[PDB]
């Protein structure tokens, strides 16, 4: 009976809750008590990457930590030389409504996606010398929210149709599709080991997936609104979630429960972009109040604010060496912090 | 200087890219972006055909003004969570079906189709982003609306309706209801038009609506209003 199945599901949820409570012998805040505080963390805008003429909905850092791609509503993908302000490429987009952008680890490809429901993979190292789209991945019934490159042939795409998928670039087909989120998926984070990847959706739940299996391993709850941003802890055994309820949450895959809630009374706007530092000591978050508050993961005490954007910080990325932070916002300007 | 020859050449390439970006931005400034929204049947196909996947963009020129429609009826997701991408569009071409006062949804037979239309209209008008993004209301399906209003009265959809079964009175009341749903009347405007399938005057009316959005945006930029 359907009622019997629902009762069994409720009993299983209660068992999961009981196990999670039994695992919570001590809180992370209590453990992080004798730790030396981070102090006042303050950076200035080292570089102001300007040239975008619309709101910047996405930005990714290359593996070299020098080339950065930015997606804006103007219909242009710009590859920036962060060291010396330069536009290596200005890729025109068929769909100006782009919400995600991804730089391949090898640096040869860049992806963009949005309301077109298509992940367009652009080839940069072409003999013709102009950026051309290698493949247009189609099959998602909802808007593209986040894409991340596993390699030159594999990409994982999160969409608003409550599904995520692993794509094969040369064939253009979905090798594996991930299903189980109730609401629209907005952000996905690839683990540093690349075996797993976690994604946050509108159902206030984050789910850790296996790219070679296709089944959800663990689901994490705790938020009261849509999870807008997600990023993996550099260890790869934890991750952080930004949601519209003005609080960040750091979950752990070895305990499947929340560890710390990064909330302040002053901030009421939600988090649009979440990114960790190199050591995980800094949980940089992009809020809708035209600010980017630098948090401390171990102690939920604010370390600093990245004021300087006239509009909402929509994207936030940290380099592979931890040298710089990009805070692309709706003010049509990207800023590099250090 | 302290710039190598390749560094200077890359800087010049960046300057050329900025020049092209500025040219494209100047071209896009003259462009006008319209968000085509609707509820129920919404008769939006008639407007798309007359006035000329997840998103469609029907581009058309009318009187030396490039127009860009964006129909998002196939999105089928939380409207709040991608409606922010359209903050800055010139206007919204909302499309209500004047002849859905008797038609009802397959599910939730208690709620009429046009009640859901007004619910979505109240959602989009009083949206947090589109406080000043004016709405070009399109009261389409007028012919069979008149046909139905010949037999069935408008009271079956609104018990508050006290007027003659004539087309003009019912149409005026529906327009008044939709305009009364505009809570913030001091910032944005509602432009109403009954779909005229003759000589393509709908494109013309959208042209005048867009011209006023442009003029009031110029005034706001100039501070006179």
């Amino acid at each position: 009976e359907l009622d019997q199945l629902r009762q069994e599901a409720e009993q299983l949820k209660n068992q999961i809750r009981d196990a999670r409570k039994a695992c919570a012998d001590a809180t992370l805040s209590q453990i992080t008590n004798n730790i030396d505080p981070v102090g006042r963390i303050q950076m200035r805008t080292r570089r102001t990457l300007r040239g975008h003429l619309a709101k910047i909905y996405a930005m990714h850092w290359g593996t070299d930590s020098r080339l950065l791609v930015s997606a804006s509503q103007d219909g242009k993908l710009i590859i920036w030389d962060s060291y010396t302000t330069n536009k290596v490429h200005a890729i025109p987009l068929r769909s100006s409504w782009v919400m995600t952008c991804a730089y391949a680890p090898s640096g040869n490809y860049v992806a963009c996606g949005g309301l077109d429901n298509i992940c367009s993979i652009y080839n940069l190292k072409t003999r013709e010398g102009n950026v051309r789209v290698s493949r247009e991945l189609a099959g998602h019934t909802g808007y593209l929210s986040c894409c991340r490159f596993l390699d030159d042939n594999q990409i994982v795409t999160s969409s608003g149709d409550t599904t995520c998928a692993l794509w094969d670039i040369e064939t253009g087909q979905q090798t594996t599709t991930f299903t189980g989120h109730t609401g629209d998926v907005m952000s996905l984070s690839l683990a540093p080991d690349t075996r797993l990847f976690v994604s946050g959706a509108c159902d206030a739940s984050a789910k850790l997936w296996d790219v070679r299996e296709g089944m959800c391993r663990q689901t994490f709850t705790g938020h009261e609104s849509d999870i807008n941003a997600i990023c993996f802890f550099p260890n790869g055994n934890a991750f952080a979630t930004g949601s519209d309820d003005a609080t960040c949450r750091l979950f752990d895959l070895r305990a499947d429960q929340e560890l710390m809630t990064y909330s302040h009374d002053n901030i009421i706007c939600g988090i649009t972009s979440v990114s960790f530092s190199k050591s995980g000591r800094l949980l940089l978050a992009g809020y809708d109040d035209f600010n980017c508050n630098v948090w401390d993961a171990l102690k939920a005490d604010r370390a600093g604010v990245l004021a300087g954007h006239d509009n909402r910080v929509s994207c936030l990325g940290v380099t592979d060496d931890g040298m710089a932070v990009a805070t692309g916002s709706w003010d049509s300007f990207l800023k590099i912090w250090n | 200087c302290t710039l190598s020859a390749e560094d200077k050449a890359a800087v010049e390439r960046s300057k050329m890219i900025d020049r092209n970006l500025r040219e494209d931005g100047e071209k896009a400034a003259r462009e006008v972006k319209l968000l085509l929204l609707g509820a129920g049947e919404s008769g939006k196909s008639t407007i798309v055909k007359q006035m000329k996947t997840g998103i469609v963009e029907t581009h058309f020129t009318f009187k030396d003004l490039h127009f860009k429609m964006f129909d998002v009826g196939a999105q089928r997701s939380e409207r709040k969570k991608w409606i922010h991408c359209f903050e800055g569009v010139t206007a919204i071409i909302f499309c209500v079906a004047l002849s859905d006062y008797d038609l009802v949804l397959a599910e939730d037979e208690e709620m009429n189709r046009m009640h859901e239309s007004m619910k979505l209209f109240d959602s989009i008008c009083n949206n947090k982003w589109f406080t000043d993004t004016s709405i070009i209301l399109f009261l389409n399906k007028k012919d069979l609306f008149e046909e139905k209003i010949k037999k069935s009265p408008l009271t079956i959809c609104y018990p508050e309706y006290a007027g003659s079964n004539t087309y003009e009175e019912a149409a005026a009341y529906i327009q008044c209801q939709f305009e009364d749903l505009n809570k913030r009347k001091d910032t944005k405007e509602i432009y109403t038009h009954f779909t005229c399938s003759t000589d393509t005057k709908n494109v013309q009316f959208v042209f005048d609506a867009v011209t006023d959005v442009i003029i009031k945006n110029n005034l706001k930029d100039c501070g006179l209003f």
Partner: single-chain antibody
Amino acid sequence: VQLVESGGGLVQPGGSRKLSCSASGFAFSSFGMHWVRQAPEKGLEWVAYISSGSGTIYYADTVKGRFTISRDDPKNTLFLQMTSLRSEDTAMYYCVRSIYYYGSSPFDFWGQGTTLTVSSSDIVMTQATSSVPVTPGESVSISCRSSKSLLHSNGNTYLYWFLQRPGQSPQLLIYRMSNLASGVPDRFSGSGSGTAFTLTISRLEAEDVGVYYCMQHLEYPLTFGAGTKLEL
């Protein structure tokens, strides 16, 4: 990708000639364009360079004033208007493309060339190796020396390696003194210290027979070397 050229042939001294370069297979507007000439039995020499958008135009000392370089981006063609020709200008000229951005591969493609016959401060490079016989399966190191250090403050060395097979056009081997070009086998490798540079071939075959040239891009009066000939 092709960069064929036209014009050429016999010309009287003091006359004028125009050398064209038809470009196909690549977005010609995006690449800055070069002219490198090779005298009958001597090394390569840089003549003129025109940039993307023709904003930057440089000439060599010998061709200053006498020659003018121009490009027609809509026509995808490159021009070299040559006036007051002398017996020094007798050479088969090459049309060379070079795109310039972060991590680009300048001088990646070289045209076949057109033969011209005229009736009868800058950085220097020495390649004293001249002619050295090689055997298949062996390994060689080609030596190039620069008078001025090519290590710029940005961290990039600006030495390029080129290979000219007998009868064929030069082909890029190494750019930025370390980076391997596109399509060249991985056996070729490049290393240097700023003023002294070497190129290593792990294993040689019949396709490695030719003469090797080293170039700089630090200061735009570009100069080649004498050449390292590899016989069999």
